[PDB]
Design a protein around this ligand. Structure first.
Ligand SMILES: CNC(=O)c1c(-c2ccc(F)cc2)oc2cc(N(CCO)S(C)(=O)=O)c(C3CC3)cc12
Length: 557
């Protein structure tokens, strides 16, 4: 019962891959220790293949089937619609990988007849054939990290035509079902501000709160055929159009449960029997499956008043404490239950008695103070990976601008405000590209965003306090400072100095540029302006934003 079988054909690249940090005239203004930053390449895919390849065994008990019955009871209340071809086509990213069959993402988005004709033929075939495995391309991801080296992650995805049909059958399902089935535990529903609020209120809801993060070793590889059938049975509880049901069963049999792996050069690389990383249902399936198993394991471990927070394969549980020694015992029982369900941990879970000491999705809760002095809670992280990618993006144009994503999702943080906003607005001012829309990612979904609209977006995801936070905590300041020394990034005082320059330059352009200077950089100056609610922030249609996650899902807004 192996996650993968392999032929020995290599996972080949699509193009030239750089492993070393590109340097330009801007590089040393951000980061001087360039040998610390690297990009993963297909060269390391061979190592990743070994890591992700193992036997899965599953022992399913009454807690499991009990939780699944409840999950299905809530699933049965969901009505989901089929998307039209044209609705699905406009959800396709502009630089989504082109079809093998003679069209690309822009053909799809323009509703070109060749594209649409092929998509109708793929759909007709899904309705007619519920057995034939669907081909997938396997590729190494190119992502940037700091040293102390990870191997390349693997992306497995079907043809463009198939991807549009997934949207047609399942987009409304994966968008509406997870909140209904999991309620407040479904993490992708929250803005970062709503998410902190939920965590703190949940932490406060307990008499003696304890919490842990539970992170599964190679989650996609732990997902069995049973797990993918159980997900399908949940989707099928929904009130669906008959073609949707058939297409969902076809996509499950032929794509989701498994299939042949082909490289970029067309060679058969092997065969998948676990989760594909680049299908529509990756995030939702993972979130459901992770919730099912973890809720069941809570019951096996008799944890009092478990609150789950689940996003994909990331899981935090906050529950009632039984004292440190017994909590420790209980976590091992939790871990014992999860492992039996084929979800063992990378690192064993540790109980925590301070909300700020729990880390999941690389992030933790911390505290600062707003204008009035009142404490505000916010999500932050070690800035190392964000900064290493900022350094890469200073010298190379990338299809996803992590700096922009990081400004949006960590806008209230010290390091995003002082370093990322300062640095990238300076570059944008110099190139006169403040109004140029840039592709970025929030919860795995693709967004095209104009840097000038950041103040609006930040106010909506965080509120006006994002522009007013101060008196950050000694622990947080310490981590950032230490990261800046390790990477060879100038100290925070240099950034305050440059921010005043950036601020004045932005004000000197007037308009939306001036708004950016006023709101984003008010922290930089001594005589603080008063920051009132932004007129335009109310106008912005933030629907699609924070209903669900779509990591690997090939979704654009
Ligand atoms: C189950 N885990 C969670 O819900 C998350 C926690 C977390 C929870 C409890 C805790 F004690 C410490 C941290 O922090 C997060 C940050 C992000 N973001 C970053 C995505 O990498 S963000 C800052 O955009 O909100 C996300 C995004 C993926 C939805 C999810 C979580």
């Amino acid at each position: 019962h192996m996650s993968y079988t392999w032929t020995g054909a290599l996972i080949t690249p699509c193009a030239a891959e750089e492993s070393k940090l590109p340097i330009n005239a801007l590089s040393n203004s951000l980061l001087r220790h360039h040998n610390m930053v690297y990009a993963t390449t297909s060269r390391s895919a061979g190592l990743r293949q070994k890591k992700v390849t193992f036997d899965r065994l599953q022992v399913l008990d009454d807690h499991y089937r009990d939780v699944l019955k409840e999950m299905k009871a809530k699933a049965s209340t969901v009505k989901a619609k089929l998307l039209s071809v044209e609705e699905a086509c406009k959800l396709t990213p502009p630089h989504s990988a082109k079809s093998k069959f003679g069209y690309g993402a822009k053909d799809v988005r323009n509703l070109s007849s060749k594209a649409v004709n092929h998509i109708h033929s793929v759909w007709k075939d899904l309705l007619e054939d519920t057995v034939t495995p669907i081909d997938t391309t396997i590729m190494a991801k190119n992502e940037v990290f700091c040293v102390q080296r990870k191997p390349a992650r693997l992306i497995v995805f079907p043809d463009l035509g198939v991807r549009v049909c997934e949207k047609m059958a399942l987009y409304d399902v994966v968008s509406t079902l997870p909140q209904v089935v999991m309620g407040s535990s479904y993490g992708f529903q929250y803005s970062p501000g709503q998410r902190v609020e939920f965590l703190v209120n949940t932490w406060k809801s307990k008499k003696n709160p304890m919490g842990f993060s539970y992170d599964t070793r190679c989650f996609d590889s732990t997902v069995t055929e049973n797990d993918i059938r159980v997900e399908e049975s949940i989707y099928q509880c929904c009130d669906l159009a008959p073609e949707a049901r058939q297409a969902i069963k076809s996509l499950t049999e032929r794509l989701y449960i498994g299939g042949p792996l082909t490289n970029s050069k067309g060679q058969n690389c092997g065969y998948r029997r676990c989760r594909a990383s680049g299908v529509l249902t990756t995030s939702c399936g993972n979130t459901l499956t992770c919730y099912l198993k973890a809720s069941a394991a809570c019951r096996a471990a008799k944890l009092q008043d478990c609150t789950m927070l689940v996003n994909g394969d990331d899981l935090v549980v906050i529950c009632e404490s039984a004292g440190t020694q017994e909590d420790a015992a209980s976590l091992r029982v939790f871990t014992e239950a999860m492992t039996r369900y084929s979800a063992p941990p990378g690192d064993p879970p540790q109980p925590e008695y301070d909300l700020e000491l729990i880390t999941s999705c690389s992030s933790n809760v911390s505290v600062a103070h707003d204008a009035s002095g009142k404490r505000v809670y916010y999500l932050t992280r070690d800035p190392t990976t964000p900064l290493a990618r900022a350094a890469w993006e200073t010298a190379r144009h990338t299809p996803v601008n992590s700096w922009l994503g990081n400004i949006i999702m960590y806008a209230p943080t010290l390091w995003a405000r002082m370093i990322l906003m300062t640095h990238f607005f300076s570059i944008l001012l110099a190139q006169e590209q403040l109004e140029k829309a840039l592709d970025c990612q929030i919860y795995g979904a693709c967004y095209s965003i104009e840097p000038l609209d950041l103040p609006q977006i930040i106010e909506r995801l965080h509120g006006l306090s994002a522009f007013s936070l101060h008196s950050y905590s000694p622990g947080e300041i310490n981590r950032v400072a230490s990261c800046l020394r390790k990477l060879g990034v100038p100290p925070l005082r240099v950034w305050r100095h440059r921010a005043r320059s950036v601020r004045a330059r932005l004000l000197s352009q007037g308009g939306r540029a001036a708004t950016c200077g006023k709101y984003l950089f008010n922290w930089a100056v001594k005589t603080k302006l008063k920051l009132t609610p932004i007129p335009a922030a109310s106008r912005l249609d933030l629907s699609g934003w924070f209903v669900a996650g779509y990591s690997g899902g090939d979704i654009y807004h």
